[PDB]
Short mmCIF file of C-alpha atoms in Angstrom, two decimals:
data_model
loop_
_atom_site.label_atom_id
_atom_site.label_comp_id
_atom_site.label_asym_id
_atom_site.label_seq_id
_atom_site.Cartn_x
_atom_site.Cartn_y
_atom_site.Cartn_z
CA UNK A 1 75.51 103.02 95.54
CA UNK A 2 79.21 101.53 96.14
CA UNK A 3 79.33 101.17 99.84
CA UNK A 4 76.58 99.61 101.90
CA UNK A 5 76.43 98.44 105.08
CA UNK A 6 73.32 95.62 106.26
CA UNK A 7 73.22 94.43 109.99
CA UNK A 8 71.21 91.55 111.76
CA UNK A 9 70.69 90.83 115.00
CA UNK A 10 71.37 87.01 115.78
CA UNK A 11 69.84 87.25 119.55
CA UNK A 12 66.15 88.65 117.85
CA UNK A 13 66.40 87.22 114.30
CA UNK A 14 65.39 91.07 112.68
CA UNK A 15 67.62 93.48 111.36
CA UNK A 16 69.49 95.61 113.91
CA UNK A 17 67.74 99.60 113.46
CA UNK A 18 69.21 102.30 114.14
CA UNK A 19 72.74 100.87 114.57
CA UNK A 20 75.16 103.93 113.97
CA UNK A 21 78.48 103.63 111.28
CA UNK A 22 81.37 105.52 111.08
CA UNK A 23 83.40 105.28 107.92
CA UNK A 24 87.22 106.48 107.70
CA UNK A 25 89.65 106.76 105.14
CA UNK A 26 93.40 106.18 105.78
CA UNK A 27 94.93 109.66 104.18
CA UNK A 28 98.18 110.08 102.75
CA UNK A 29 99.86 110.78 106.14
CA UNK A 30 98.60 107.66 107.78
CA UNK A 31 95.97 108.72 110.14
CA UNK A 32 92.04 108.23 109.82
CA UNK A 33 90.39 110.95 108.17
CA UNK A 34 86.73 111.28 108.64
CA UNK A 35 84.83 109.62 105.52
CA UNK A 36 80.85 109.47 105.97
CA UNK A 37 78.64 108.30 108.41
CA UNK A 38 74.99 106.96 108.75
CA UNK A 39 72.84 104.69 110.78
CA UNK A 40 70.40 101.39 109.62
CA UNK A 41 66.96 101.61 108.64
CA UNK A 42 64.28 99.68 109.52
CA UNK A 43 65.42 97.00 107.35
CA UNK A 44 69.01 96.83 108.99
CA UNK A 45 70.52 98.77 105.55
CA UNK A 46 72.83 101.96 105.66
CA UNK A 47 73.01 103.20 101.95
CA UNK A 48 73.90 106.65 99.97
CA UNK A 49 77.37 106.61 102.53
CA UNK A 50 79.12 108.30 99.40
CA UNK A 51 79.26 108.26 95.40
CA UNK A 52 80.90 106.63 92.87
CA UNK A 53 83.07 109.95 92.29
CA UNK A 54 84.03 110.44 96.16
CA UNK A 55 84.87 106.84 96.85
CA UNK A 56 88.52 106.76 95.47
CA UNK A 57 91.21 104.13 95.89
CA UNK A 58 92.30 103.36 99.41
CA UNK A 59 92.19 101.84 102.83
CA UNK A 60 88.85 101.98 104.24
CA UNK A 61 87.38 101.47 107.99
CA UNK A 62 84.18 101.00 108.97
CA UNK A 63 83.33 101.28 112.49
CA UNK A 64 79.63 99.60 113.37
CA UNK A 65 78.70 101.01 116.67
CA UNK A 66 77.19 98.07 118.31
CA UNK A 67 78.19 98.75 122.15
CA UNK A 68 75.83 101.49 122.11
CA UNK A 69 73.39 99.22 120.03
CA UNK A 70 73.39 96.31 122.79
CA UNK A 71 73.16 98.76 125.96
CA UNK A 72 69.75 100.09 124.09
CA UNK A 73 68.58 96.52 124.71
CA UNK A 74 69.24 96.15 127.92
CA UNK A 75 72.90 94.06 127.41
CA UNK A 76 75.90 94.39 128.15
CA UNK A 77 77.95 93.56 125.16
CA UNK A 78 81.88 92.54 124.91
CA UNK A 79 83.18 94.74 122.06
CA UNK A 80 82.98 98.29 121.97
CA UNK A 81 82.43 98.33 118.01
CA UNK A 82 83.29 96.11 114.90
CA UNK A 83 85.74 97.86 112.78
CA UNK A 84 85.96 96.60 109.12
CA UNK A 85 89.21 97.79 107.37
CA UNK A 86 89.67 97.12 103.68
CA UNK A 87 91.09 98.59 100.72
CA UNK A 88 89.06 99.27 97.97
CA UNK A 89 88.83 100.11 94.48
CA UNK A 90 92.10 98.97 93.85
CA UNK A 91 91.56 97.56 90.93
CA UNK A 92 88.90 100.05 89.48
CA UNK A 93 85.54 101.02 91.10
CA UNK A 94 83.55 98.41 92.38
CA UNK A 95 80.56 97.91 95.20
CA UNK A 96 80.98 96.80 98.30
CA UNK A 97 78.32 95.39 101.02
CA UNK A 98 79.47 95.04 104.83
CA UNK A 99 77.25 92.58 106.37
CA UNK A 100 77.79 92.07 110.04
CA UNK A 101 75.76 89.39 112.49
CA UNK A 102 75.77 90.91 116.20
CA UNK A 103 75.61 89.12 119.49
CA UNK A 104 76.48 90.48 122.52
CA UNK A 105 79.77 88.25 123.04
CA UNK A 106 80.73 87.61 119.24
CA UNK A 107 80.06 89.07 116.07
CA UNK A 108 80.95 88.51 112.28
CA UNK A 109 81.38 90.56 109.36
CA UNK A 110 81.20 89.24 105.67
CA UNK A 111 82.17 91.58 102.52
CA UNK A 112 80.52 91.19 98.90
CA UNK A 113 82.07 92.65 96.43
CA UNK A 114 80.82 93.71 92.93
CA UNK A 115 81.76 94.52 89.44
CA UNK A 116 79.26 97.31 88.52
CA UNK B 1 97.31 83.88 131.53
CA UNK B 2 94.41 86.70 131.39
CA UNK B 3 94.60 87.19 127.69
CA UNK B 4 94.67 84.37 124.94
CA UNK B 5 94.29 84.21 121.63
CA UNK B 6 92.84 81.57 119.28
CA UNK B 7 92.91 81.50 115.26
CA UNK B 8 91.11 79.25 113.20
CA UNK B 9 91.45 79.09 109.57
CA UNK B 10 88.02 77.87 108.17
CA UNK B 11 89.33 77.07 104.36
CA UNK B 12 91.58 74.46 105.61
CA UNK B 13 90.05 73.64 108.78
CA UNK B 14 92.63 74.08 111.03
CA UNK B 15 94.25 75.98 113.79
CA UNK B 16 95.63 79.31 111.70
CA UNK B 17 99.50 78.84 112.47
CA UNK B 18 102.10 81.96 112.70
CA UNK B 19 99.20 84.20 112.25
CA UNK B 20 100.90 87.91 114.15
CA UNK B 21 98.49 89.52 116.61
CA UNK B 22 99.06 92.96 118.06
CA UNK B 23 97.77 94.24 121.04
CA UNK B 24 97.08 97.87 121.74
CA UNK B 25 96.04 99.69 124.99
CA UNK B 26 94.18 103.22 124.72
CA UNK B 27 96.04 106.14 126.11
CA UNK B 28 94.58 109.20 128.31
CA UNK B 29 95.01 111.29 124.40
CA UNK B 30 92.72 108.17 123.04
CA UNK B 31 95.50 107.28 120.67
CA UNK B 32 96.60 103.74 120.63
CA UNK B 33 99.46 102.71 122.88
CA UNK B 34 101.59 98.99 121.58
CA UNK B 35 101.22 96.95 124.56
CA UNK B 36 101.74 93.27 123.44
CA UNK B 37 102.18 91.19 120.38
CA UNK B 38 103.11 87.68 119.41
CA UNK B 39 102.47 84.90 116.74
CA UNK B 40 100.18 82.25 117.06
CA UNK B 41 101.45 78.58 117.61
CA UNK B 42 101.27 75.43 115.66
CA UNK B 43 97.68 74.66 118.25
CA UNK B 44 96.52 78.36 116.23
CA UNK B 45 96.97 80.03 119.95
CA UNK B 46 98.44 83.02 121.32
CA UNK B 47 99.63 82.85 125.48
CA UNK B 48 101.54 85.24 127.47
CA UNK B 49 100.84 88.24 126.35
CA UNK B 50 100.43 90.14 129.36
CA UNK B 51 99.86 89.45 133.04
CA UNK B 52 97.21 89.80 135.88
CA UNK B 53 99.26 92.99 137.21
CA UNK B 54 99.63 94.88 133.81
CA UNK B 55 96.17 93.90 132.36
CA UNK B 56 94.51 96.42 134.09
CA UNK B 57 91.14 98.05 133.11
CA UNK B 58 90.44 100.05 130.02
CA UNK B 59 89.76 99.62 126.72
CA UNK B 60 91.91 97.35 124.02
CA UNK B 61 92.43 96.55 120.64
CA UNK B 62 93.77 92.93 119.34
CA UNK B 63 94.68 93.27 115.77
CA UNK B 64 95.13 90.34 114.15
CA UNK B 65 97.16 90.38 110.85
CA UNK B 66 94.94 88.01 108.21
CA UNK B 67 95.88 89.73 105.00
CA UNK B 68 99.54 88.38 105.74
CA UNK B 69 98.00 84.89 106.48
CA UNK B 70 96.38 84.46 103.41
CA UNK B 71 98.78 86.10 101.54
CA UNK B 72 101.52 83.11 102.70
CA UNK B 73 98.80 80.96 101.02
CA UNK B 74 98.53 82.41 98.00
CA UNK B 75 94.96 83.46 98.45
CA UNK B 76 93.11 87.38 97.68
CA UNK B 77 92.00 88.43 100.66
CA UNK B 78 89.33 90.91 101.95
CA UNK B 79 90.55 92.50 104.87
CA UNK B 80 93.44 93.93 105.81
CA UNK B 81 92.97 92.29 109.63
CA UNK B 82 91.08 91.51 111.68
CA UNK B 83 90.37 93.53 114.79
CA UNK B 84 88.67 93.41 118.22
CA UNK B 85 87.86 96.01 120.43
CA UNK B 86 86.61 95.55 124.17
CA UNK B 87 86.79 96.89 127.77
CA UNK B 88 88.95 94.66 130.03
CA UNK B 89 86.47 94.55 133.46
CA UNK B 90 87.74 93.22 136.77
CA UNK B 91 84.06 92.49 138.23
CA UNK B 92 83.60 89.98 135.63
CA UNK B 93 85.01 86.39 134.55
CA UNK B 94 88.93 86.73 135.02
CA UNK B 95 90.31 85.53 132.01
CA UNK B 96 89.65 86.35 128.30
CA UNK B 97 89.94 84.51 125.22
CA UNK B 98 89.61 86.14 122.08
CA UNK B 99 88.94 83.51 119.26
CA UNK B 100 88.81 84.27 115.45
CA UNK B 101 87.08 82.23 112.77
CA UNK B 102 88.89 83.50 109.29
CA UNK B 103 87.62 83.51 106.06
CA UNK B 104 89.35 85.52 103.10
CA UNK B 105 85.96 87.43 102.69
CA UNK B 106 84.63 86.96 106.36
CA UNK B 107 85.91 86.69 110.01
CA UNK B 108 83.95 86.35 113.14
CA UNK B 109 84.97 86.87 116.70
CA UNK B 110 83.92 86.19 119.89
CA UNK B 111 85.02 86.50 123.59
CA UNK B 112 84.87 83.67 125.78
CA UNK B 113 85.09 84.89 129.18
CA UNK B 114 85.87 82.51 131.99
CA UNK B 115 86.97 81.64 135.70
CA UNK C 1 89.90 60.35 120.61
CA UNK C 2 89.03 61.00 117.18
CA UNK C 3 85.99 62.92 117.82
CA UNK C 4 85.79 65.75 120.22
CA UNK C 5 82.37 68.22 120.38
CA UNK C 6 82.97 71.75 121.60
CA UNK C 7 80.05 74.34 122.02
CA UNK C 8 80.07 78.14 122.46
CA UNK C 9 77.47 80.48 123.73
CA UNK C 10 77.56 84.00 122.06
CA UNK C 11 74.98 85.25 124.41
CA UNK C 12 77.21 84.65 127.23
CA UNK C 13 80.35 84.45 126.15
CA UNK C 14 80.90 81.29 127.80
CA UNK C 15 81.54 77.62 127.06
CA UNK C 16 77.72 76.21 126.54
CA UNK C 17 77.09 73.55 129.38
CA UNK C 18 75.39 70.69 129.92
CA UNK C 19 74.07 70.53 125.80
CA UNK C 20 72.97 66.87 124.88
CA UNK C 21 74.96 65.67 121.71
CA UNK C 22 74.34 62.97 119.94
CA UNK C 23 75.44 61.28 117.17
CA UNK C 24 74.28 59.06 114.65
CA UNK C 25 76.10 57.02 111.69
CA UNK C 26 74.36 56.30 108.41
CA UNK C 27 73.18 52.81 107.86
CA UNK C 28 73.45 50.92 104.60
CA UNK C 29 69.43 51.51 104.05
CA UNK C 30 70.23 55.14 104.94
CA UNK C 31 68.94 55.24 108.05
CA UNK C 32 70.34 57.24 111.06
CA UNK C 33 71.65 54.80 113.26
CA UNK C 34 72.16 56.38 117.32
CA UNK C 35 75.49 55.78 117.37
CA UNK C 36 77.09 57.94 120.67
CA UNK C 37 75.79 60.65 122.90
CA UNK C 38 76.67 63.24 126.13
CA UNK C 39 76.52 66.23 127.33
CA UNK C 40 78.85 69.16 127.46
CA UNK C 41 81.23 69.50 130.19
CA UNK C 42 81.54 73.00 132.30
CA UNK C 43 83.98 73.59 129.44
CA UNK C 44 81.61 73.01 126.54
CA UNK C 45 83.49 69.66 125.93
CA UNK C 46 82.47 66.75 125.02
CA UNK C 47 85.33 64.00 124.79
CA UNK C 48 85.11 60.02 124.45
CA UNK C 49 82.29 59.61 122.45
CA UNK C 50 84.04 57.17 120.50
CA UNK C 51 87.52 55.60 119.88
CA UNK C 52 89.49 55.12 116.76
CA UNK C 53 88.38 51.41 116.76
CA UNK C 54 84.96 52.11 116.36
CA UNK C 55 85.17 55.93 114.44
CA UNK C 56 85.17 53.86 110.80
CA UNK C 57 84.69 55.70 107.23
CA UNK C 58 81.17 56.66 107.09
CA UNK C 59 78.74 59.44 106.70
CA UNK C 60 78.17 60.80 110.50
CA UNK C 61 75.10 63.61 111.94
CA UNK C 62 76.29 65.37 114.84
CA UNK C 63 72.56 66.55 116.54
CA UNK C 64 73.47 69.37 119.23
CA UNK C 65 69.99 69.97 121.23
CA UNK C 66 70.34 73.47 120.68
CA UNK C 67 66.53 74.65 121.75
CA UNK C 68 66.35 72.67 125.50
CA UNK C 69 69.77 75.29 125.46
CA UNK C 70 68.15 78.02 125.22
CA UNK C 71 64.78 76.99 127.07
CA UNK C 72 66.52 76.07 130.31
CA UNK C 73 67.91 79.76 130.09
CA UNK C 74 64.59 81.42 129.18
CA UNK C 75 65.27 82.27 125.90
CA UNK C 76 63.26 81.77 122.64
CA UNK C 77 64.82 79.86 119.77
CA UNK C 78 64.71 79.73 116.43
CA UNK C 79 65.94 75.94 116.06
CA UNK C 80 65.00 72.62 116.87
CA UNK C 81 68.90 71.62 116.93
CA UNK C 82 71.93 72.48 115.12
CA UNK C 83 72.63 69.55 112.48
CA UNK C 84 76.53 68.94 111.38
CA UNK C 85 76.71 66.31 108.50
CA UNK C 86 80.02 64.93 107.46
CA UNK C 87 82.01 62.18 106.05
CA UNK C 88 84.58 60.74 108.47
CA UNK C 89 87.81 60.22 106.07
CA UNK C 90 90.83 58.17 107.05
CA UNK C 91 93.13 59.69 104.46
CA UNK C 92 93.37 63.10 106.28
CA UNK C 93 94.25 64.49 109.77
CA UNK C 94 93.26 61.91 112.26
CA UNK C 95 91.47 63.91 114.87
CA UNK C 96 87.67 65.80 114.62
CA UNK C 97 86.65 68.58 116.82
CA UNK C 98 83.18 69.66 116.00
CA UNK C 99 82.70 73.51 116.83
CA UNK C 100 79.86 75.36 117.30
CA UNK C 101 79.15 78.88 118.42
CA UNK C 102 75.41 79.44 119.96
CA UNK C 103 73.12 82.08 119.40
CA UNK C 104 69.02 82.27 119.58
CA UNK C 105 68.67 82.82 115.83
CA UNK C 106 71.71 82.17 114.66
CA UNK C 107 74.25 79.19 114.52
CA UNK C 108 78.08 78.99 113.38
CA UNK C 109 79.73 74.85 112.76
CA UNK C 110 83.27 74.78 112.60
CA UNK C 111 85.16 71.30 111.69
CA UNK C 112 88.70 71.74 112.95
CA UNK C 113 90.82 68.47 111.72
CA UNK C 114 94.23 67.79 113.34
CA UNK C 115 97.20 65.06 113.43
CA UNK D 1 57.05 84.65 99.75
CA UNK D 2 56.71 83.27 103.33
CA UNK D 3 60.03 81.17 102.69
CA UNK D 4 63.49 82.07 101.56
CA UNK D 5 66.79 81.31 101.32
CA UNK D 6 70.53 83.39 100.66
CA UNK D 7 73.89 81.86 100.37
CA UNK D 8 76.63 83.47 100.11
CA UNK D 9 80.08 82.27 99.57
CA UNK D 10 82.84 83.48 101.84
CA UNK D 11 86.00 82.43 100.02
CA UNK D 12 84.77 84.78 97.18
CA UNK D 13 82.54 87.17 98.76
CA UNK D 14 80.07 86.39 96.38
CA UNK D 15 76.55 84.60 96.08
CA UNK D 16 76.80 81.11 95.97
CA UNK D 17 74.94 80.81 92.90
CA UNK D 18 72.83 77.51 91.72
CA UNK D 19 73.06 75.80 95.45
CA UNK D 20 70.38 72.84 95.51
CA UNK D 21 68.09 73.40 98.44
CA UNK D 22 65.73 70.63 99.65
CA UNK D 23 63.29 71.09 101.98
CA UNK D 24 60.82 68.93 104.14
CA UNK D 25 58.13 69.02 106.79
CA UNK D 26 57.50 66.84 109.62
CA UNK D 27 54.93 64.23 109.18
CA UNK D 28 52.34 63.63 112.10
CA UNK D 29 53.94 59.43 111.84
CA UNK D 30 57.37 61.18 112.61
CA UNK D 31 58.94 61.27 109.04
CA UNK D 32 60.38 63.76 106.95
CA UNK D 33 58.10 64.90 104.16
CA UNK D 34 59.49 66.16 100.90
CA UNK D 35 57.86 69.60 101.06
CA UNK D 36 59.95 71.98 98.28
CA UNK D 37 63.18 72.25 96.08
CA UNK D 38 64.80 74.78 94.26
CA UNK D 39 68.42 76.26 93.55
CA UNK D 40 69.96 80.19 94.37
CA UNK D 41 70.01 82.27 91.93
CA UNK D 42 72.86 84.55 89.96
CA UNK D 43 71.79 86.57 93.16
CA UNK D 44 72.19 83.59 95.88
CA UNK D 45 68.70 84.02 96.50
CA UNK D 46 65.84 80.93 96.09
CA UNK D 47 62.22 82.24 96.45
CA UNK D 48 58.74 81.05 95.42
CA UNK D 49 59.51 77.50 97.23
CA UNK D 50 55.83 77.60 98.78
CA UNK D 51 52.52 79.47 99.45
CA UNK D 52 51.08 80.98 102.71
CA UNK D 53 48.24 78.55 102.13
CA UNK D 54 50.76 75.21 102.08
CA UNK D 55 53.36 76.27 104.50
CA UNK D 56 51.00 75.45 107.63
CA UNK D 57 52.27 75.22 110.99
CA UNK D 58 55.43 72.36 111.58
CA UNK D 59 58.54 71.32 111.72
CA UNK D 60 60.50 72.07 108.38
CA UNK D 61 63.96 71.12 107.60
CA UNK D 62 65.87 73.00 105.14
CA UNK D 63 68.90 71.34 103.63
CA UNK D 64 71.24 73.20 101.84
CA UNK D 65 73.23 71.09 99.22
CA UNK D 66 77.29 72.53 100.54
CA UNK D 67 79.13 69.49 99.44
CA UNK D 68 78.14 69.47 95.24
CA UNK D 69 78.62 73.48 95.30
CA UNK D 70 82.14 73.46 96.76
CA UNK D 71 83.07 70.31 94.69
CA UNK D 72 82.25 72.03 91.60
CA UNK D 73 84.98 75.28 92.54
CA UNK D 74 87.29 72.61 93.09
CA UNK D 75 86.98 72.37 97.21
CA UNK D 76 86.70 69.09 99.05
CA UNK D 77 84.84 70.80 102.12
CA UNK D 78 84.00 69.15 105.19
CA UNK D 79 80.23 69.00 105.67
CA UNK D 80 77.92 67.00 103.30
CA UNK D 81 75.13 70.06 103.68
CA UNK D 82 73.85 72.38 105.68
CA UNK D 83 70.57 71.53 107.76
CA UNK D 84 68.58 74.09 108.99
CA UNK D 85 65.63 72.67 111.41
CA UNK D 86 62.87 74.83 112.86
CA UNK D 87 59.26 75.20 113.86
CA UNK D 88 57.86 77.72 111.47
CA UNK D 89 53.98 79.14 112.25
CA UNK D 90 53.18 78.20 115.62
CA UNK D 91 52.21 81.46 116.81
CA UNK D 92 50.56 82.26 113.21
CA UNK D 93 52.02 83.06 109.74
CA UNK D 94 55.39 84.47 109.66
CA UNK D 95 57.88 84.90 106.87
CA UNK D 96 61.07 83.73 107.16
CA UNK D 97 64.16 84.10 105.64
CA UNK D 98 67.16 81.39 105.84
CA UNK D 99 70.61 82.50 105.45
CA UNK D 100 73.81 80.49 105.22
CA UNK D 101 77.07 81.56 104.80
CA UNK D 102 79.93 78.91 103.64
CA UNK D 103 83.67 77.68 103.91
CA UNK D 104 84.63 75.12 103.09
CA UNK D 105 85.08 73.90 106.53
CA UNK D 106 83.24 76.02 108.10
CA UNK D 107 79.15 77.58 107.91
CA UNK D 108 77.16 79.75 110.00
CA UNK D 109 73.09 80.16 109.04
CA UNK D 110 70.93 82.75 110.52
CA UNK D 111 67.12 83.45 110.50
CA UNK D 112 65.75 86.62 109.76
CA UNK D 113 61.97 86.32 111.09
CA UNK D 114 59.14 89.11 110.35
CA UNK D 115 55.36 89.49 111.06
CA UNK D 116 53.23 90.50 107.87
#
């Protein structure tokens, strides 16, 4: 699995469920194409986005949807969603793991990258 | 000033200097409309990038360029920026300070909204 | 002033006021020794703990009471306090803001050092 | 494993493999108590510090050795380590995990508590 995606929730100390994730791919013309999409688990984790075959070279975004997360929970949050924009595989295939820490007026987002 | 910007770099621990930030307004088509940009200061900050009677409600984007800023240093980066997406409210706190904590494999960002 | 404390609150997105701070130099038998204290201004400041005089080379523990924070808001913490440990150097930049950014279960420390 | 603790390094997006980690309890004369030790793992990971049965209700402080990793990549970093303080078990056994993320000048560390 090349691409996952693991979200907490710094207000509750748990993973954040059900948090949905929209991935894009910059295309050759320069706008966003469509790429996969998915939501957490119970454990926070969003895996089997794609496969080693689909996951090509370029300029990747990943959109956490944590507006819509927040306003589940009652809160009013400042961002309408974390967007992660790499490239990737640049220099061959590797994995990749998003992590992002969420509270309602601040967020970050930390990358680790593998050499499978 | 109803829209600041502050960069930290948290390698050197510093204020991130001549970082470039643009700012982007969404349009009625939901495409992305230039609205302001700058470079941050020596102090890592951003001012005067709009005004109370243009900063009107809707939603924005502040993207700020870190793969340039760690490129000048000679360090791989992660990311090719940073970015930060909100809806500007007039019922709450009037002015808006979007800070940035950079790492070359981590950011984090939060909104400090004040009177 | 060589050593400036600012504090965040990422629940909020406000400056975290009225946080007791206090600080504490390490003694020769390795003690902490109190060494300055305050609270957080409306700003989440806290300036003129100490002077330059006074701010010698040492090993320093910045203690911000983190969980009376969070109590006096009705919120359930995860920690005691946030703990910043550092060595005060007089070869670098000559000025120390301590940053932190506030949330229930989760803290961020950020040592900005400036001329 | 009612205690753990994952660094990761945020210059490399990487582990932070072989971190010292120190941790203590709260003795009822006020004192800190060496209660466990260990170092992260190839995966940043440290588990296996305690038992259920010895990690009774208190206050523990974890301290995660920053200064010797960084110094050994190189890095004069600001902090001498990370301390992590908390009541753990007052409201019965929980599990708890300890994460810490690190710059040179700069950490965050979040707790990821769960009921088993």
């Amino acid at each position: 699995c090349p691409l996952m995606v693991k979200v907490l929730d710094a207000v509750r100390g748990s993973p954040a469920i059900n948090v949905a994730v929209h991935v894009f791919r910059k295309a050759a013309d320069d706008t966003w194409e469509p790429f996969a999409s998915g939501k957490t688990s119970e454990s926070g984790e969003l895996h089997g986005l794609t496969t080693e075959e689909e996951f090509v070279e370029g300029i990747y975004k990943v959109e956490i949807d944590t507006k819509s997360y927040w306003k589940a929970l009652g809160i009013s949050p400042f961002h309408e969603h974390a967007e992660v924009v790499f490239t990737a595989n640049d220099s061959g295939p590797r994995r990749y793991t998003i992590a992002a820490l969420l509270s309602p007026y601040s967020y970050s987002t930390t990358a680790v990258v593998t050499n499978p």
